[PDB]
Symmetry: D3
Subunit: 243 residues, 6 copies
């Protein structure tokens, strides 16, 4: 019956929904919809698990993207085909600034495009910027639930290891492009490393789709469980102010 | 004198943390005179600088001139003097059919069709405006009830070929920029201007807060009145109040 | 508990294994593992389901990579941390050549790097090339079972849609870089489109690891059972690389 | 007015086909005053224009302002008005230990460290001055007896990080320009400035003739920021191109 | 056009006698020596850096044609031979190894090249792999076993210069442009076997046009070792790699 | 026997020479050298044929470079090692402008860098500019010999065929980068295609060596695609720089 190639979903399945909360982990999908009205599992294929929920009478989608830009770009595109116009990304991130602690919540304004997929939508010249209303909603909801929040630039990498300048690896080597890259992003005022924002933000911003980015700090490079739900409450509360 | 170009000493600013930065040296005094105690400080090359006061706190109005290069001088030297927040007011060319001459555009981030931005950060780095500054600008525009569009701006190092203008001497647009206007349109870019990429990049990569606002003087879907200038000017000053 | 951050595995779970068949789909793991002796499930986290099996009394690994180079870079890296030196990828592909049909088996010599993750291991000048022994084992395993095989260059994209030049999408546009791209890879003799080989092949070739790639054709682009043949080939290839 | 920025008509030129183009608008009058019948034409933004007469021929003096963009406006609009020959006169920073403050530097071609040049020609294309324009400048310099150095000039879109200045607000320079001055120096580049790349590229690729000449005001092997032979040369050079 | 189907090489389709394989050395002087390992070799033409000979291998006609040093002259040779009817190109060259484990006199077979050249970009963008044909590489590896050489199979760095691109400081200048500064070490860590000057162009332009191409080279110097080989640095290193390229060609006719 | 690796020459062989005429054809070395006094053959190895000659009783070298940058970069570097500080290239060229004719002499000020070897000396931003004194003598020699001479930009390709947008080729196809590039170079006022100037000028300008570039038009590309003044000019130009 499916409308799209990967998600295994019809336009009818969205039930009029126009906004989607897009977490990375399939196992975090249900936990998010649970904070909303009438949650029901829609479909689960590959790393794309999807649920439908309700927020103030209007339908919303929660759908996982998986790790990295490519997988994300499949999800966002197919959700867009289905009718979704607003994308809210929740995820996890590693802070590169000393003042940001494990537990702090990060709202991304724009991202450093250290990926490949963004270039398949707009040339490097193009800014991987978030939607203004989405970011506003993400911050005003963050201030409203009493979260220690930092708003700024994120480094978005195609690799977990070398692109985020991790040295404790099989080779122990980091390619020239990324040698001392973290020290540079730090100096530029970049808050954090994650893997999906550059793709999400570029492909939405260059296709009239609205996207926001929020993430909870798991590790701090320079240096628990209640940490996560803050970003989960925020990404759900922000959704209400966007419907 | 403390800085090489602006001819300003730290004292001339006297505590000022924010600077409204127009393009035209002639547009400077006109903006400074919407605030309290407007005093001319210096004037050298294309950099004309005035000091005004806003709610009892000192503010700088300083022209950047045309292009990223001269912007990179004015900004750098104002930053040396203690300015931490920049609000650029400018003129702009709309490339979207729904944006009319007279409107106000608040730039979230800029398409880096320049060279100067690369001297601060590689191309991967976004040319994004400071969040607080964008908010101030948008809310200032909301209050005075101006027609406002918030989105992406194409920031070129040239007025003509980089903005795909053909009524030129050569009538030629180099491959890179041939058909590029139709491309920016499809991507949801609102406008062309010539400074934002440089300003927004050099600020977001050095801890400086920057905002971008511009009045639409032309719509590119048509060709290549006066309430346009003063509307964006009222906004940039109103936003300034809120970042002091 | 675990010697690696993502896979949820220890060196012990591998039992001395040095070869990993690396499929895309987690669902494909058990199937591939079941063509071998003593197949056992190891772990399953995110997009990485891992099984261990045996061939001629040698420990073999089957571990999924998910979609795209990013997650592929995680699996390969963490398998490298646990002892794997030979990586055989099996996947699915859309053939861009007119005379490569649905059901055909394709062995990748090297890949057109239309990805990001590979640049995190080597500059663009460096070739996304397969190991020769792996490629040899793959082609020879392919010909020994009679499958229609093609040996050549694969275009490896970071997107399923604009990078593989699909216009049949939400916006209907393809970025300038990729507009008319498929028609150019065609004349260059590129066989097919997929999404992982550029990363896999680059990160192995520049890090002293061995990698090979085989894929069954599910789509012919100039236009718009199959599974088990590539699966048989990848196991038969693995057999010849222990 | 026939042009958007300069505020000038073709008639203001009086058949002038040559424009001496300074950076600083406050220096236009001074150049024009060294010629016959100097008449102020217009002043808008950073563009101040004067007509002058030389050997009984109309010659424009019009300022460009700091940087490629502001220059690319002035040149284009002067070219629309009738100017076909462009001589830039400005200030520069020497990067060779043996170039003295006051020396005149003639540029043969420029290191394209700018952005505007790419809006006229791809990076492969040389930012090269016109031969006749360069000759006129060298021959003029040798006739007045100024200490003259002829060679390549690094043309940066910024005054500070692109010219590797460290006495800045942040005190940092981006990776690309970290140790870039030493490289230009080893390659025998004479000096830094901000307009020549743009001028020379946009002219040489549009059938317009351009020469470049500058006065040394600071030596970069000693200071970052400092504590008119150039002017006479650009006028005499113009005299020979009329 | 003094009886020539091509501009540079000075050859006609007839000169080839239906030869579809060409062994392509870099040095015009090496051409006669290589054809001398085959039956009925005859000089065809000699213009510029392109000296060509026809020989017979297991009864079938084969071309030996020099390319000259670098991608530009190689691309001319390959293109013009392809017009004449050549579909398979086997390059036999000399090389400098960069791995400590690769000794002088060793034989190296290239799977693919690091594109430090310019001419390859005239056939495909930088993302396209400078990969050798599978059958050509298979033929060379098997031929190496037949001759009994010490063989390594892997990635080669193909440079457009002999000096700064191969990070040689022993030059008039003594400087190396930022791009190639500390590059050899990086290639070493990336397992690159050797430096040479033609493979990247040959392999790209052949793989991107339906032509089969192989690459074999003999190590005449190791860039990490102190001791540099005697008068016959090439003489019997050539004899190994040349004997292999000819043997590989037998299995591609 | 030899102080250099390729040319087979010793510093003594040059007899104090500091200027070299560098043709691209080893067979044309003798002819060129034959126009001077005391022409002695020195060496022939690979594509590098080197003669010594005397001009106004001052030693001069004629050394072939072969086709392309790589081969040229070796010759120049090794001649430079042996004492040569001035290089004068004399090649054949294909004109891309309608007004330039078969037989016309083309003097290069600077080159469009469509090569790879130049990048081994300077980044792309650095201009491939000829030495001012070298060009001057070449233009002056051009007047002396009396020939239709054009001075300007040259497009310097790493291929005879696709980089010069030729279609009389095996495939009949040209890569995106160069498809429609010839007329693009036309509109930019580029005079001609050749294969060695970008490397020669870049490697000399960025290394403190003097370089000059002259050529004889053998084909006009607006009309077709395939098949001594320049020789005399490059010899007479040498006389002015010894
Ligand atoms: O420092 C970090 C912290 C978290 N992640 C997240 O972890 C996932 C990969 O495990 C990615 O989706 C990414 O969002 C990182 O990549 N880097
Ligand atoms: O279409 C337009 C309209 C206005 N401007 C503005 O006008 C100035 C130069 O004309 C620039 O600083 C820019 O802000 C443009 O660049 N393009
Ligand atoms: O035309 C195709 C056919 C299959 N795939 C494969 O399908 C997976 C995504 O569904 C990717 O990992 C990729 O290997 C493509 O990318 N393109
Ligand atoms: O060291 C120097 C000296 C002068 N200038 C010139 O001075 C003006 C701005 O200071 C610009 O036109 C620029 O070309 C520099 O850029 N760097
Ligand atoms: O260290 C070496 C040894 C040999 N060659 C080869 O020798 C020729 C030039 O000497 C070139 O064709 C090249 O392939 C090198 O480039 N580098
Ligand atoms: O159209 C032409 C004509 C001649 N040449 C010259 O001829 C030689 C190759 O035949 C090269 O040195 C090159 O400079 C070209 O490159 N293109």
């Amino acid at each position: 019956k499916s409308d799209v190639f990967h998600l295994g979903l019809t336009k009818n399945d969205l039930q009029g929904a126009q906004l989607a909360i897009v977490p990375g982990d399939p196992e975090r999908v249900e936990k998010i919809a649970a904070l909303m009205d009438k949650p029901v599992k829609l479909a689960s294929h590959r790393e794309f698990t999807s649920w439908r929920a309700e927020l103030d009478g209007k339908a919303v989608i929660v759908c996982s993207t998986g790790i990295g830009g490519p997988s994300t770009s499949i999800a966002v595109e197919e959700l867009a085909q289905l009718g979704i116009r607003t994308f809210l990304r929740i995820g996890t991130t590693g802070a590169i600034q000393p003042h940001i602690n494990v537990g702090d919540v990060l709202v991304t304004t724009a991202s450093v495009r250290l990926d490949g997929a963004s270039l398949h939508f707009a040339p490097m010249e193009f800014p991987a910027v978030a939607d203004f209303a989405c970011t506003t909603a993400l911050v005003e909801a963050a201030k409203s639930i009493g979260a220690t929040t930092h708003v700024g630039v994120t480094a978005s990498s195609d690799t977990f290891y070398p692109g985020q300048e991790r040295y404790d690896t099989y080779s122990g080597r980091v390619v020239r492009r990324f040698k001392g890259s973290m020290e540079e992003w730090q100096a530029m005022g970049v808050m954090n490393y994650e893997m999906e924002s550059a793709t999400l933000l570029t492909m939405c911003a260059s296709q009239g789709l609205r996207a926001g980015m929020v993430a909870g700090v798991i590790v701090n490079r320079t240096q628990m469980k209640q940490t996560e739900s803050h970003a989960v409450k925020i990404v759900v509360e922000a959704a209400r102010r966007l419907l």
